[PDB]
Amino acid sequence: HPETLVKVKDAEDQLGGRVGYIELDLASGKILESFRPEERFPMMSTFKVLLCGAVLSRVDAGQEQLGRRIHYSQNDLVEYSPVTEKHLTDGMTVGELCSAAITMSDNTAANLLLTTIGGPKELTAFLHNMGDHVTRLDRWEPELNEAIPNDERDTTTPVAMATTLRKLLTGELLTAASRQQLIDWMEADKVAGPLLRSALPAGWFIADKSGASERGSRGIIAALGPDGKPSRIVVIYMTGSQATMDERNRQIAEIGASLIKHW
Numbered sequence: 179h180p181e182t183l184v185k186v187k188d189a190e191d192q193l194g195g196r197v198g199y200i201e202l203d204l205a206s207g208k209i210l211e212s213f214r215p216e217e218r219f220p221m222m223s224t225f226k227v228l229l230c231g232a233v234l235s236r237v238d239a240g241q242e243q244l245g246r247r248i249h250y251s252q253n254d255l256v257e258y259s260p261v262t263e264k265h266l267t268d269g270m271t272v273g274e275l276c277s278a279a280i281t282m283s284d285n286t287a288a289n290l291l292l293t294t295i296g297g298p299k300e301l302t303a304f305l306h307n308m309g310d311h312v313t314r315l316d317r318w319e320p321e322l323n324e325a326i327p328n329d330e331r332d333t334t335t336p337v338a339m340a341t342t343l344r345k346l347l348t349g350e351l352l353t354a355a356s357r358q359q360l361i362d363w364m365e366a367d368k369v370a371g372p373l374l375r376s377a378l379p380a381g382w383f384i385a386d387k388s389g390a391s392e393r394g395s396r397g398i399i400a401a402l403g404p405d406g407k408p409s410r411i412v413v414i415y416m417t418g419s420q421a422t423m424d425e426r427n428r429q430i431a432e433i434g435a436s437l438i439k440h441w
């Protein structure tokens with residue numbers, strides 16, 4: 179419950195590796211505070227929000243339909259696919275795949291969606307085309323979690339991710355309906371309980387997306403605020419440590435407690 183930047187630096191002291199952090203005012207885009215804002219970190223599963231941003235952009239362009247049903251085989255399944263592995267017969271709609279990728283971190287869902295847009299290179303092009311010249315996706319799930327330092331593959335920076343997330347959620351890039359659908363999926367996140375959500379007071383809004391590598395790395399991106407409306411964006415990444423998952427979770431939770439206390 180220290181001052182937030184103090185807590186972030188403390189988390190890095192305890193974990194080893196690097197911790198990156200930024201808080202943006204949602205309305206203005208103003209940077210409120212940051213630590214290692216321009217350094218690269220692996221996105222891990224946080225990329226799944228950007229992926230669904232690209233899918234929605236295609237919907238807005240009349241090139242995709244959220245209701246379109248996709249079928250796949252057992253051979254398409256990769257690890258960490260809790261939703262898709264249950265629909266080998268009936269398949270899933272594009273919208274259902276985005277819900278699964280975002281709310282359950284479903285990897286096969288993400289890969290199927292990557293296929294719809296033309297792969298990691300096209301996600302990167304989508305990002306470049308909306309003004310993010312930093313964030314890059316190079317690999318599919320699960321290889322994108324490899325997190326080699328000093329590998330620039332599959333990385334973002336706290337400020338690039340925060341800025342891009344803000345544009346996807348509030349900008350004129352997506353239609354109002356699509357911006358709302360994206361934040362709705364994030365609001366319905368099911369797997370980030372131990373992170374920022376654990377520090378969230380009653381009545382607050384949060385829409386988020388977490389990510390993990392087996393070893394060394396963790397992250398979360400979020401739009402949150404009091405009184406049922408988001409008012410800030412928070413991005414936290416960690417990488418390059420030997421910290422346990424429990425330790426990584428705890429530090430993010432404590433960073434969350436600090437940023438709430440000192441809101």
Ligand SMILES: *[B]([O])([O])[C]([C]C1=[C]C(C([O])=O)=[C][C]=[C]1)[N]C(=O)[C]([N])C1=[C][C]=[C][C]=[C]1
Pocket residue numbers: 222223224257258283285319320323369370387388389390391392393
């Ligand atoms: B993702 O981080 O690219 C993916 C799926 C995953 C997400 C989350 C989360 O908090 O959203 C937690 C765990 C896994 N990561 C992986 O596929 C990675 N190989 C992995 C798998 C299991 C546990 C840790 C990392």
Ligand SMILES: [Ca+2]
Pocket residue numbers: 187190191
């Ligand atoms: Ca340090």
